Amino acid sequence: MLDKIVIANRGEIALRILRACKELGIKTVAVHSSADRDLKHVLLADETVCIGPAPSVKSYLNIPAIISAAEITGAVAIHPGYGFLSENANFAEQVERSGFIFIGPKAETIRLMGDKVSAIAAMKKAGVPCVPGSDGPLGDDMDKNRAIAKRIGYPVIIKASGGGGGRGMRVVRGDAELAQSISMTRAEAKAAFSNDMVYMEKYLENPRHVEIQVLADGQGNAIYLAERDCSMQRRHQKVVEEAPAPGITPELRRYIGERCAKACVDIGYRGAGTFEFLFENGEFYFIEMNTRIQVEHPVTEMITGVDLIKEQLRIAAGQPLSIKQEEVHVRGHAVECRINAEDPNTFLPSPGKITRFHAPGGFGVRWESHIYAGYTVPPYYDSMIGKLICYGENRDVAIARMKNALQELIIDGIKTNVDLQIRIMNDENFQHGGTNIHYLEKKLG
């Protein structure tokens, strides 16, 4: 095992990693901004280092300060969590050249999957089904771009090669909008990602968001740990996640999973990763790969029994995968509700002091949050303050437990999306299952 690690993150994920470290007897170094002295994980860590003032650019995104804290404490590894520097290939490369273990994939793999054009090319080569599109970058020749748009099937989407998630996209209904659209995206991409490379892709009308969890040791072994349905979204931001995805057969799971596992070997993947797809008419279409742990990883842990953070730590330590594909079994169902310090109606973030707090309990109830009574949610960071995960023997039990747990959850002093989550659990279409990616916006409209 790794003797001592730096947790290069904050909030709920930092607390998640800290628990995993403590379970394995790994010493923890909590690096934090001056605004995050009162974070729960900071108070629980063996050593703490203040890495700079409140803005992320000065603290959590500050590479030299993070490296220096790792050198000063005698740490051997760095876990970047999710967000911040987790998908920054230059950070991964610097961590390794400085002699530390980077708890993530190789910097080259981050670059390969990070550039969306080459990622799709790599997946097509690996045998992973992708969304029909340009299959390369787009030029200045409108005649070639229009011929490509008719080849795929209108409507189409203009995507930034350096973009990802919910940023760097523009939908095209017809050829009249096409020219203005290919130009606006290039200007936005060059300003936001410092790369003007764009590509064209088929805009799928009625798709579901289905993603595959993988674990690869970087020694030739790679396993798939079922799927997650993350279709309940608003402004390209996940709200509810669940595992397994409803309507996915053991045969469909096996088909897509084996392809994802094979793709890991072919790209030399190391650690935990997720292959995101759009699922429509019984077919999967690759969109992107998250080369880190995901926010929604707990729903996969509940249904497989696999602790995903401990496995990241074992792989980083140089241990080959002990878990064999034949040992991965889907059992029961899990639902995750993201808890955000925001007004759901207006999207207005709600930082501030939590005057009253009470977490739900019970069988199959998992609460993932650093929040406590008297704690101030700082205005400098993202709105996500916690995650409520409920497990049951079937989908209906997990939903029933989630309704009860949401009713027990008290967060006063700030605005939350708790009431929105209660509305989603009570939604008859959600209760039936299989709602598409556009459902939540339509329901709220």
Add this chain to the structure above:
Amino acid sequence: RHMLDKIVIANRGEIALRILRACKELGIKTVAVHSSADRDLKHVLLADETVCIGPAPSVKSYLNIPAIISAAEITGAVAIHPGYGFLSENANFAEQVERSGFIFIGPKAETIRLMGDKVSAIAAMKKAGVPCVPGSDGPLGDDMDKNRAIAKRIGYPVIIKASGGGGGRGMRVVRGDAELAQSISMTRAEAKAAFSNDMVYMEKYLENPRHVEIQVLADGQGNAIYLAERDCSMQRRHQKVVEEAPAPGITPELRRYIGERCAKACVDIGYRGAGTFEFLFENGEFYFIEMNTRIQVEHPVTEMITGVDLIKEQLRIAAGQPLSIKQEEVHVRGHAVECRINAEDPNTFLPSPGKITRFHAPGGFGVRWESHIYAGYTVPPYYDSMIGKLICYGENRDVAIARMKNALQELIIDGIKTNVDLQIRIMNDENFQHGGTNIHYLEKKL
């Protein structure tokens, strides 16, 4: 399938909240019956209906048979869940409930009566094939020559036990003939005063036993299953502190052997609902001591390793539904540890009442928190010291223990004294980390 419309939760604290959650999941309307001191209980605050049944002393509230039955009638409830303790093993209450036309969420009154009489309960178990402690196999008379002959056949040390006794009450260890007559006479007088039943029996006293118990479920359709075992040996002066499932050192073959015998005994006695067969385990052999005719405090450790919601099964059985799982569907997976959290003084072990000023619950993968407490809540001095239960699960015993250590360190209960520090000490104990420690261990450590 048909389900109970509304039930009265005839209990308080953590178990009342546990029962409330199971009801809500099943769409059953809840009736929280409470004493005047228990208006601010979490489950009372979450219940669909509330009925104040009397003042703080349990005799006028939680043990008050007419007021509890009256609250079921007033609210139009169809069933009564007694939880554990209070009226849960009271056969007169269960008889009065049935008589009043309400469902008693438990076994038949006559089954409670049968298992509540320790002499009759042993005779029924021995007849069914359940292994028993060698003993008198009937009541002791006043003839001391006969009592010395029974003691010689059993072999000293022996234990004199009250037929109306149970748990940690109504027993006396005898090491030789010199103490026999007086020990029998003293047990009789104590039994007459406490139980209005002076019947005593003799049992072989075991030197280093483990307290291992088998969980059962039996429906009204003739199905009876076993849900592995629990080791409750980590205890002090008849008070459980740590429980775990499955029991260390128990092989699948040993589990199958004892479990099948317990399942067969349910069928023979016409058992209904949740129940536990309590055993003393020593030298790879099981010895029946008593049967709990209700749910136990430590039921969550069995739920974690089997996936079975024991409270929801009680509610399903009571509604007239078959068991939701078959024996072949019951699988032991992983390991679970329960730390009882008490508002108690660590030097005296007596209840420590008062107001909770700051409260923080632990979280994480495999962490389960069973408690009604919240910040600002006042622990009343009228009832037991138990304020909560911390349950950690893992794919093996070591992971469960590692998760417990971290969970206990995150647990904050300020304003009152707790056994949190003692629980941290037990988790750090190398003999506990090895496992298989006997019932006498904790007292010897302290």
